Amino acid sequence: GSSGSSGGQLSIKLWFDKVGHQLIVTILGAKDLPSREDGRPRNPYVKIYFLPDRSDKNKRRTKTVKKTLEPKWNQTFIYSPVHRREFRERMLEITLWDQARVREEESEFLGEILIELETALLDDEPHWYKLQTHDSGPSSG
């Protein structure tokens, strides 16, 4: 199986704690996700990755929701030390996927949400960032 590519919307709450110099990012929940017709739902799950580096350490992920087109992690993620000037050289990379297979990494990728701390609208408010489903994306410093 595994067919069709569509993206909905995801709500991510970003914040910048200039106090302790930490980057806040709460993964609210997703909605209007691509489901099936006369079948079954899926297991949506977000995956944050404070670039650079994409493997672990400074990687934050939310609990994998089971059967739910509208997940609600509303979790919290603090990234420090994080400076305001760093935002320029520090960008967040969120991506929504679906835990299809089991005990594996067979993701179907629901979309990708890129946010540049540089121009990251941080106001401790919930923002819905449309999901992008198009392999190969831009990138430059």
Side-chain angles (χ1 to χ4, degrees), residues 1-103:
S2 261
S3 63
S5 206
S6 186
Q9 287 181 257
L10 178 56
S11 206
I12 296 130
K13 228 184 307 183
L14 301 172
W15 166 260
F16 179 53
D17 249 346
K18 66 245 181 182
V19 177
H21 283 150
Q22 339 173 126
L23 166 88
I24 283 54
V25 37
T26 268
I27 299 299
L28 296 154
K31 64 103 101 201
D32 295 340
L33 302 194
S35 196
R36 87 305 187 180
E37 289 161 49
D38 62 10
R40 278 286 163 81
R42 45 175 68 158
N43 308 337
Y45 84 71
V46 197
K47 202 222 289 216
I48 308 129
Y49 257 130
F50 190 73
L51 279 11
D53 219 295
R54 236 164 108 276
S55 254
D56 73 90
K57 243 204 283 135
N58 65 11
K59 171 223 65 168
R60 281 284 173 194
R61 217 202 290 170
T62 59
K63 45 152 203 273
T64 285
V65 209
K66 309 250 206 145
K67 300 172 159 152
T68 216
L69 310 185
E70 269 158 278
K72 289 205 256 205
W73 318 275
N74 245 271
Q75 282 243 59
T76 288
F77 298 139
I78 285 150
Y79 269 115
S80 110
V82 162
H83 320 168
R84 177 52 184 86
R85 52 239 156 195
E86 283 247 292
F87 277 11
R88 161 170 143 68
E89 306 159 326
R90 268 73 228 179
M91 155 179 213
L92 269 163
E93 167 165 288
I94 318 79
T95 29
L96 193 67
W97 331 63
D98 157 20
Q99 222 246 24
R101 300 300 232 190
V102 51
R103 284 186 126 165

